[PDB]
Ligand binder design. Structure first.
Ligand SMILES: [Zn+2]
Length: 322
């Protein structure tokens, strides 16, 4: 299971939070027909605050709203994610085989996470004091779904730089889904991961910033955003699967810089370049930052031209990936 809130963030809550705050985080941490191209198939379930999946079926494809905000958001944001991948890249669902998009809401009691489990999305309600409901932010929904895309293509392992790249691809595609939904060019996009997910009172903008890694939060409870912004400050650790959540800001910032330099809608050039790279049969499952970067420059040349390739190469250079 790929969960959006990392273990070190929950551990931080367990040590610094109030009794009820510690308790929900502890339970969260310790917990153990296909579509034809162009038309999504969704099925949304209600876990009714138990942890049995998928739960009770509440809204299948075309079914009217049951007026539960969580079900509405799951249904709508799974739809927008499908539409993005079809309109931008002519891809038919997460696996390019028309996989129906399944989601279960109200998982557990005050469950402080959301995750893709290899076959479906699962969403917690949050606690209302640190995190809001986990259907609330469209980019976070897209981020988690995007792990299914990566698994069906290059299949990058969840370890060190390959794992940081796996995380970064989810942030890239989650951001593009949001920008597509809001009709934003690169110069207008917020470039935040999880805007709206942090509860009122928490001192932060979101989980991460793609433009300025390390600046997203600074709160007595949650701690300080640990992400470095360049390779000079890359963290060498065996913790966090070798730093998959710590060091993803470096490739995230490379994408931000590339998209900024190219202008217009970020999915049309920079996005397509990253997509071509993920789908490249020569990209190894244990690829490092340097190998991934070189591959993006090749596809920039291939799909576009030398000027676009220059701008992509300079973005990687700026964040310290030679
Ligand atoms: Zn992820």
């Amino acid at each position: 299971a790929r969960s959006v809130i990392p273990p070190y963030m929950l551990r931080r809550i367990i040590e610094h939070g109030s009794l009820p705050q510690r308790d929900c985080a502890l339970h969260t941490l310790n917990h153990v027909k296909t579509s034809t191209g162009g038309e999504v198939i969704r099925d949304i379930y209600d876990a009714e605050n138990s942890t049995q999946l998928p739960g009770k079926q509440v809204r299948n494809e075309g079914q009217a709203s049951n007026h539960d905000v969580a079900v509405d958001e799951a249904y709508d944001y799974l739809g927008v994610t499908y539409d993005f991948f079809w309109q931008a890249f002519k891809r038919n669902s997460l696996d390019n085989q028309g996989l129906p998009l399944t989601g279960s809401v109200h998982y557990g009691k005050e469950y402080q996470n959301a995750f893709w489990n290899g076959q479906q999305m699962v969403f917690g309600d949050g606690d209302g004091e640190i995190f809001n409901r986990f259907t609330i932010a469209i980019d976070v929904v897209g981020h988690a779904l995007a792990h299914g895309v990566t698994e069906s293509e290059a299949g990058l392992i969840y370890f060190q730089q390959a794992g940081a790249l796996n995380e970064s691809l989810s942030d890239v595609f989650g951001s593009l889904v949001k920008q597509f939904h809001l009709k934003q060019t690169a110069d207008k996009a917020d470039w935040l991961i999880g805007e709206g997910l942090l509860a009122k009172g928490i001192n932060g903008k979101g989980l991460r910033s793609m433009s300025a890694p390390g600046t997203a939060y600074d709160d007595p409870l949650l701690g300080k955003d640990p992400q470095p912004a360049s390779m000079k400050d890359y963290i060498q650790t065996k913790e966090d699967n070798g730093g998959v959540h710590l060091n993803s800001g470096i490739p995230n910032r490379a994408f931000y810089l590339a998209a900024t330099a190219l202008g217009g809608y970020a999915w049309e050039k920079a996005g397509y370049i990253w997509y071509d790279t993920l789908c490249d049969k020569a990209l190894p499952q244990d690829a490092d930052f340097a190998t991934f970067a070189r591959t993006t420059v090749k596809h920039a040349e291939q799909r576009f031209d030398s000027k676009v390739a220059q701008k992509v190469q300079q973005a990687w250079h700026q964040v310290g990936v030679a």
